[PDB]
Tab-separated table of C-alpha atoms and ligand atoms in Angstrom:
chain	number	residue	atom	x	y	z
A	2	UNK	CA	-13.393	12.068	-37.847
A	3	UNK	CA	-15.072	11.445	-34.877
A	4	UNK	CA	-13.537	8.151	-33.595
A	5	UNK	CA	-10.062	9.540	-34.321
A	6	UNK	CA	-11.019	12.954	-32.265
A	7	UNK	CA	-11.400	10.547	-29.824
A	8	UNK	CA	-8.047	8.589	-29.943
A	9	UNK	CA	-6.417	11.719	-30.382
A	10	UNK	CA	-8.196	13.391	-27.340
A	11	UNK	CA	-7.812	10.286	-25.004
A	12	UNK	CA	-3.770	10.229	-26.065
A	13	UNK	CA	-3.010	14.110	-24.706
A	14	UNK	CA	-5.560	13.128	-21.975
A	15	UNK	CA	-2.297	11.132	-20.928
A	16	UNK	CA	0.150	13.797	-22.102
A	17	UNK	CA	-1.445	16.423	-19.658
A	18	UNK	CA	-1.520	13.708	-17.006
A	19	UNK	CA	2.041	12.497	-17.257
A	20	UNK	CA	3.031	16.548	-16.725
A	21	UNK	CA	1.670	16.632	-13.380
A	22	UNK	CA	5.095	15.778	-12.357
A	23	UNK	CA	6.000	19.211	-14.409
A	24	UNK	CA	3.557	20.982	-12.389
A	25	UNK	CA	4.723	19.560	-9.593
A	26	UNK	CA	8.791	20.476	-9.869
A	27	UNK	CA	7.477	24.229	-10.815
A	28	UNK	CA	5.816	24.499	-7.775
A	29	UNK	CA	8.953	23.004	-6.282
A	30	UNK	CA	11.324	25.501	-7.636
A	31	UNK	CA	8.536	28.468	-7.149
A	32	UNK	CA	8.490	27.608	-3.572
A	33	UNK	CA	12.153	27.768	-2.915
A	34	UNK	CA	12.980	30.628	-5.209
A	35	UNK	CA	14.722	28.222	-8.036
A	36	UNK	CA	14.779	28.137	-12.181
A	37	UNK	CA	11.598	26.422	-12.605
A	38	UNK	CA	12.854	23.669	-14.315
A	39	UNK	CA	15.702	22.856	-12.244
A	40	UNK	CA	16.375	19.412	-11.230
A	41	UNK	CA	13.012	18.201	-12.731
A	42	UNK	CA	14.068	15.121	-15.044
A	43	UNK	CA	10.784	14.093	-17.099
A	44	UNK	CA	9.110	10.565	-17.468
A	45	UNK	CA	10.310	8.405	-20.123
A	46	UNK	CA	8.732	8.784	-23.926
A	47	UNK	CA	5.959	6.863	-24.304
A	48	UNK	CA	4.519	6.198	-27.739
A	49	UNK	CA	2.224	9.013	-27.280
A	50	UNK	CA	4.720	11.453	-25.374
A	51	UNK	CA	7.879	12.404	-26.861
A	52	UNK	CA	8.932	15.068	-24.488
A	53	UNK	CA	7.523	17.135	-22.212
A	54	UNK	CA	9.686	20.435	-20.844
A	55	UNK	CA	9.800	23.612	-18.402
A	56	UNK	CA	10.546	27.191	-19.617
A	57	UNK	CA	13.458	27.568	-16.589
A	58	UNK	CA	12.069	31.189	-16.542
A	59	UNK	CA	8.494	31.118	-16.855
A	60	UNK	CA	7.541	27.908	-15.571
A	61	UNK	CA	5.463	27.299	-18.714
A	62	UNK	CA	5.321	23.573	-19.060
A	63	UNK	CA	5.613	22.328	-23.514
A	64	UNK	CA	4.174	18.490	-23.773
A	65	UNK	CA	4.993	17.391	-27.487
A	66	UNK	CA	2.935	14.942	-28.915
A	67	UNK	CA	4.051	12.315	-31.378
A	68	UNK	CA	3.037	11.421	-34.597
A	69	UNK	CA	0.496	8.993	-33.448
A	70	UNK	CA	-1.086	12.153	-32.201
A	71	UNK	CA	-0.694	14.623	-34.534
A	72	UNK	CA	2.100	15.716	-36.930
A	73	UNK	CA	5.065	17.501	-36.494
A	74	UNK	CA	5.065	21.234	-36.089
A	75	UNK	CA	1.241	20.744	-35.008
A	76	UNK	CA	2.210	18.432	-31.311
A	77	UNK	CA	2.897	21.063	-28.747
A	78	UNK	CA	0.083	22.215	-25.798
A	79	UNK	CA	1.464	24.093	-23.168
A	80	UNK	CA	0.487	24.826	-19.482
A	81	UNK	CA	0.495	28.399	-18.323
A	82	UNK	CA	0.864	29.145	-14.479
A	83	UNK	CA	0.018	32.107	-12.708
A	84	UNK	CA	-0.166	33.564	-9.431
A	85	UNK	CA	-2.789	35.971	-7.887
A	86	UNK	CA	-1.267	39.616	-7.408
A	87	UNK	CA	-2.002	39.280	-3.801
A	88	UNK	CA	-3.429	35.963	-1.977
A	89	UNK	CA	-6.342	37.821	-0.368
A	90	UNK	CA	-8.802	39.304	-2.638
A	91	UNK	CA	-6.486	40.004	-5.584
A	92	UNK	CA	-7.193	42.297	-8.585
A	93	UNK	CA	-5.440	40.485	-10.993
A	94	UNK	CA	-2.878	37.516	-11.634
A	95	UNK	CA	0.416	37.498	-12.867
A	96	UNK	CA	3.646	35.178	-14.274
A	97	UNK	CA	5.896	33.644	-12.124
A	98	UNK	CA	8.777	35.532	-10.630
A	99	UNK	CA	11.581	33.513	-11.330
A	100	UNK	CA	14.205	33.811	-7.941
A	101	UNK	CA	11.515	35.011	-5.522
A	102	UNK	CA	10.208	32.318	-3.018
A	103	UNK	CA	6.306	32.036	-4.017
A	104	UNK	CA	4.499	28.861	-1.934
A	105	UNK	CA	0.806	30.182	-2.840
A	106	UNK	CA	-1.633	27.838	-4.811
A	107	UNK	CA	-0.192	27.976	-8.756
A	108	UNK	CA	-3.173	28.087	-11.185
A	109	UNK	CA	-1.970	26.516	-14.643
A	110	UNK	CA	-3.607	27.020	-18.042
A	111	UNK	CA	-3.929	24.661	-21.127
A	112	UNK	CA	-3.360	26.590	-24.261
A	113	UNK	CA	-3.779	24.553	-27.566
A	114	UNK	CA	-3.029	26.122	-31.501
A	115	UNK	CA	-5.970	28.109	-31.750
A	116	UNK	CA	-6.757	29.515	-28.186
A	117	UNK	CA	-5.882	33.456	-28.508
A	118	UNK	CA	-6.441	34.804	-25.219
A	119	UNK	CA	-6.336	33.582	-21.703
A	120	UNK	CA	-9.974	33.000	-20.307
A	121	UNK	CA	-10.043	32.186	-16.614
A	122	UNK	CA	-12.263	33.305	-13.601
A	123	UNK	CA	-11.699	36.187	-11.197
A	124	UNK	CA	-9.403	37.441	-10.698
A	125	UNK	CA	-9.205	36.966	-14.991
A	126	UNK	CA	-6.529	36.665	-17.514
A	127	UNK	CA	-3.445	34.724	-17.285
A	128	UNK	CA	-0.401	35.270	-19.014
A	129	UNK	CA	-0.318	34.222	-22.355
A	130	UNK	CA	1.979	31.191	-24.000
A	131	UNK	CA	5.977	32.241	-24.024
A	132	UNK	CA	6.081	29.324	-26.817
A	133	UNK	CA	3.320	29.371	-29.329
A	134	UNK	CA	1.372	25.619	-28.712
A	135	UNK	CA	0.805	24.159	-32.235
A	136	UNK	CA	-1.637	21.159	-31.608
A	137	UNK	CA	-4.880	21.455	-33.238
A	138	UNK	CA	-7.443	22.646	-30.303
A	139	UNK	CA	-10.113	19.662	-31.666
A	140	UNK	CA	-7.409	17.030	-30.681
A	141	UNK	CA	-7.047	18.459	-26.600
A	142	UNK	CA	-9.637	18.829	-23.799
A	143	UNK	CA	-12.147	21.268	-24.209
A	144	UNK	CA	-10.151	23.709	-21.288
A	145	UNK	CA	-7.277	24.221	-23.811
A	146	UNK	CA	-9.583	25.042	-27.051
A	147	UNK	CA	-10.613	28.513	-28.285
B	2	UNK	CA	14.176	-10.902	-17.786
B	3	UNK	CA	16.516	-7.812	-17.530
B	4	UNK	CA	14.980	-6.471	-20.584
B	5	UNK	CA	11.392	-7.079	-19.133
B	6	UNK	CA	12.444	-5.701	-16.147
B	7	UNK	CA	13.832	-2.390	-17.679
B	8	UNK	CA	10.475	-1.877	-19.733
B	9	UNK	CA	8.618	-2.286	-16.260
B	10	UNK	CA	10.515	-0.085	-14.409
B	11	UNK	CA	10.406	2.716	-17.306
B	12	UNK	CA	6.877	2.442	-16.981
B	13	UNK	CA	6.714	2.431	-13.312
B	14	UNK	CA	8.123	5.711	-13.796
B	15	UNK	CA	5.394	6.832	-15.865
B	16	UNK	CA	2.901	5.983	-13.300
B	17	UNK	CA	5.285	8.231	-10.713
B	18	UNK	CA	5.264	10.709	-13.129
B	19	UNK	CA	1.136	10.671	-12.862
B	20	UNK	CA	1.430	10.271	-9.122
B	21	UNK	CA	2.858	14.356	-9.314
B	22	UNK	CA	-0.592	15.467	-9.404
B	23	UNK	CA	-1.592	13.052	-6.137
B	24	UNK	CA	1.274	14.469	-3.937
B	25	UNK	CA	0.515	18.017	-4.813
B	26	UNK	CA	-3.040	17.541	-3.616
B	27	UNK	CA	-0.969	16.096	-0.461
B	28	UNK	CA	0.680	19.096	-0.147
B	29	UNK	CA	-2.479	21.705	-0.305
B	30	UNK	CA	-4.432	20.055	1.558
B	31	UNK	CA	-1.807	19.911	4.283
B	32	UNK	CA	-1.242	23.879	4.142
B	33	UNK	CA	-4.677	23.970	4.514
B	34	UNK	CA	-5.474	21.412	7.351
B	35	UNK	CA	-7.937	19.073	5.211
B	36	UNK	CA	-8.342	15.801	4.613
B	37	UNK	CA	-5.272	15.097	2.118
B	38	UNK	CA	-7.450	13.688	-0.249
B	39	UNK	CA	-9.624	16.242	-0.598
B	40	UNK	CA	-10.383	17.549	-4.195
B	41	UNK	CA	-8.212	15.252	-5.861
B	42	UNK	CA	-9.262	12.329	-8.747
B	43	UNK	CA	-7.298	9.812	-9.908
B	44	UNK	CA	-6.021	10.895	-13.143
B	45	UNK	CA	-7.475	8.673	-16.302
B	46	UNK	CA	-6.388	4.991	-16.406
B	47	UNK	CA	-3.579	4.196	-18.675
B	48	UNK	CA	-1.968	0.976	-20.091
B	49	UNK	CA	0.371	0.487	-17.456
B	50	UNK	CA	-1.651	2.256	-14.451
B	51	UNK	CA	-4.923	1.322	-13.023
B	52	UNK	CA	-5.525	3.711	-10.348
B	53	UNK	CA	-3.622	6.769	-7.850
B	54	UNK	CA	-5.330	6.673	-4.214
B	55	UNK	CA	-4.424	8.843	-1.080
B	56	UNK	CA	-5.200	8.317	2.115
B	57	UNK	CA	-7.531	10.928	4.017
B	58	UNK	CA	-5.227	10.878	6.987
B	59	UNK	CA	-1.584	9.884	6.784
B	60	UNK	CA	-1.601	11.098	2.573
B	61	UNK	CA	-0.108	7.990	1.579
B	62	UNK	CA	-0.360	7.373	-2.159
B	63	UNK	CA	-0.984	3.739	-3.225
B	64	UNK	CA	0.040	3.400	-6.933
B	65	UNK	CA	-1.573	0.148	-8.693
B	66	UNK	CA	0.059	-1.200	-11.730
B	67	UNK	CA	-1.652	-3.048	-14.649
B	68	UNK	CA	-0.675	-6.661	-16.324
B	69	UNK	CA	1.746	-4.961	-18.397
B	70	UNK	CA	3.732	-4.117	-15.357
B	71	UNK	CA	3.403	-6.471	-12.662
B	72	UNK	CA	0.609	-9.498	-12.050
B	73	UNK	CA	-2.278	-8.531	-9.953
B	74	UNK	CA	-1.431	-8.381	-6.085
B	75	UNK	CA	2.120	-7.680	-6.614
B	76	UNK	CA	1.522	-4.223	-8.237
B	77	UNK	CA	1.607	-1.511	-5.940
B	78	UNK	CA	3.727	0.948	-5.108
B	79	UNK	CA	2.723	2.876	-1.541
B	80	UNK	CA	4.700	6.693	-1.581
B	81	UNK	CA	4.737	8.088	2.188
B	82	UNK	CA	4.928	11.923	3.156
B	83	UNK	CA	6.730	12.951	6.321
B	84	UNK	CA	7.696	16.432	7.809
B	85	UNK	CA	10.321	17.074	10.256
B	86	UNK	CA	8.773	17.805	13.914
B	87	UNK	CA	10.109	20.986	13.820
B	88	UNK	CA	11.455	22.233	10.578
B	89	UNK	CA	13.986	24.750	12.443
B	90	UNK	CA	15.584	22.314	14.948
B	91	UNK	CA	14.731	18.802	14.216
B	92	UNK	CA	14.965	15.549	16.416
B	93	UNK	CA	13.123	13.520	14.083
B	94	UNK	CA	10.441	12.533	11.284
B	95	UNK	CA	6.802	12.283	11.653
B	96	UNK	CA	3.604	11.431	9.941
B	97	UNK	CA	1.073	14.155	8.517
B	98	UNK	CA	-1.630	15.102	10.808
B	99	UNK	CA	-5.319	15.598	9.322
B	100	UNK	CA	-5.888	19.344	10.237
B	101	UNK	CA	-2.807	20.582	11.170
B	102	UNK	CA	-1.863	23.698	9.205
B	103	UNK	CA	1.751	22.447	7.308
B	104	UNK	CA	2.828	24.783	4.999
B	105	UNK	CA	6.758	23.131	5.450
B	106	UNK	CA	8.667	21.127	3.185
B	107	UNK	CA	7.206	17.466	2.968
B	108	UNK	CA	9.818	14.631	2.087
B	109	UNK	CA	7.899	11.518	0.220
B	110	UNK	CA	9.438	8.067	0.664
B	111	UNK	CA	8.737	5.349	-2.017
B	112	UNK	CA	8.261	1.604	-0.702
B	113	UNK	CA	8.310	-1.418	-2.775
B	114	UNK	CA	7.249	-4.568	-1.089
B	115	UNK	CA	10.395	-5.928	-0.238
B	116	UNK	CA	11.566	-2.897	0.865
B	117	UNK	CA	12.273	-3.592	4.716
B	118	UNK	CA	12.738	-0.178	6.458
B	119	UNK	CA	12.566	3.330	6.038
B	120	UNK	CA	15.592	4.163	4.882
B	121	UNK	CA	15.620	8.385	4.737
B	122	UNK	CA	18.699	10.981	5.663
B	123	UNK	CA	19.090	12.491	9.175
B	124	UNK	CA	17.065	13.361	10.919
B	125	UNK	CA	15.996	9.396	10.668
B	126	UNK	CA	13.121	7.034	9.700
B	127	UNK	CA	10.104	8.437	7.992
B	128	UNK	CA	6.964	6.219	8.911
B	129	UNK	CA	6.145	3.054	6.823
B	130	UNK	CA	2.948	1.730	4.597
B	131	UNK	CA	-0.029	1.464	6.597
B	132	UNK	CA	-0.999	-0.772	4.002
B	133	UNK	CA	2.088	-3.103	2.234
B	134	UNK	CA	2.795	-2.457	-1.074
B	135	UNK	CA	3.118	-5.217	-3.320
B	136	UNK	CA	5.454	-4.311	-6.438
B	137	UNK	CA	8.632	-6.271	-6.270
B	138	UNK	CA	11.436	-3.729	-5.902
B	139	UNK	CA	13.408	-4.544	-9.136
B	140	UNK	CA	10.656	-3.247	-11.001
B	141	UNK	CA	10.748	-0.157	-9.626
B	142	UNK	CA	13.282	2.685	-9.851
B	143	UNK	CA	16.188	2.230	-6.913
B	144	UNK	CA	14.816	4.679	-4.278
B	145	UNK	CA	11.504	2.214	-3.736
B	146	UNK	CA	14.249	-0.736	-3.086
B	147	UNK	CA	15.336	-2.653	0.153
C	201	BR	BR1	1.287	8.389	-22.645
C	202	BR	BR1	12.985	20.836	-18.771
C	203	BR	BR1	0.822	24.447	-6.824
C	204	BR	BR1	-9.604	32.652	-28.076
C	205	BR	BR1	-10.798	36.385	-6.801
C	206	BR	BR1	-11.593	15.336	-24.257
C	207	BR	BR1	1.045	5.739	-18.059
C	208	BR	BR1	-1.629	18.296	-10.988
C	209	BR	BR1	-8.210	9.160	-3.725
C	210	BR	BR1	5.216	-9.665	-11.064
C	211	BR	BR1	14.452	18.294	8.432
C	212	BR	BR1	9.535	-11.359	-7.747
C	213	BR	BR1	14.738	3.025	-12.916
């Protein structure tokens, strides 16, 4: 329904803002050539939140969702970030390098269940989800839907 | 209450957790000598957080808790960035500077209200709250204490 689109949507409004601090040790750990998910300890659950995690080599950030949001095995949005191939007028942009010391601007895309291809501007595609997401695209901001 | 006080504290955290996305904003904007709040919003309101300000010239974050966290006027949390003088051979800590190009590391102090003194590693003091914050320290995790 309708009104619980909009419960659901408000909820993993708050999961995506609560991972800024994901985004945040990524860029850390990009900057100073580190696993991108070292040292970053995430906030506490909340009864929205249950976890929310960094692929160490990918920097691809997995917010899970609890059951007040949607049901198990359909929870998970992830955050992509990429990197521009070169900073001035690049051709193309491209995963993190995990070990190399990268300080540029990191772009980061929401991918929900049913979104099956990266769509961002020039200089175009991101990298695609390392871990399929499994929440319902309805239930997220409109960014992370098909 | 020590169990009140450990609910407030783990959701003092949250609103940290939130305030990612205000000190990377911090960060850009100083690498690009702007106005450190430019094109950053604070993120939606939550239960436990009303609102994530910066400062246009020092990039000092003011966090303001709700009821469910502290009583109005002794709510805020104030988060300070700092950068060495000179990142190779230091003498000291200083404020940002609006429109100076700093692409070094920035260290971010946290400052409950009863929190005296900057109280950083060498090389020394960072600067304090232009404004005071207001949360009482044992709400907040240890590093915003006296
Ligand atoms: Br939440
Ligand atoms: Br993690
Ligand atoms: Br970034
Ligand atoms: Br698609
Ligand atoms: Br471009
Ligand atoms: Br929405
Ligand atoms: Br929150
Ligand atoms: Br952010
Ligand atoms: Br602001
Ligand atoms: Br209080
Ligand atoms: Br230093
Ligand atoms: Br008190
Ligand atoms: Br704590």
């Amino acid at each position: 329904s309708a009104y619980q689109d909009y419960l659901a949507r408000s909820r993993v409004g708050e999961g995506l803002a609560l991972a800024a601090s994901a985004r945040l040790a990524v860029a850390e750990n990009a900057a100073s050539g580190n696993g991108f998910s070292g040292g970053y300890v995430s906030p506490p659950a909340t009864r929205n939140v249950e976890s929310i995690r960094i692929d160490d080599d990918t920097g691809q950030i997995a917010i899970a969702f609890t059951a007040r949001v949607a049901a198990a095995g359909a929870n998970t949005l992830v955050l992509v970030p990429s990197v521009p191939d070169q900073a001035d007028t690049p051709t193309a942009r491209v995963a993190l390098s995990k070990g190399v010391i990268q300080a540029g601007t990191i772009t980061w895309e929401c991918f929900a269940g049913d979104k099956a291809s990266s769509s961002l501007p020039a200089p175009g595609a991101g990298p695609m989800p390392t871990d399929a997401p499994t929440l319902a695209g309805k239930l997220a901001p409109p960014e992370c839907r098909a």
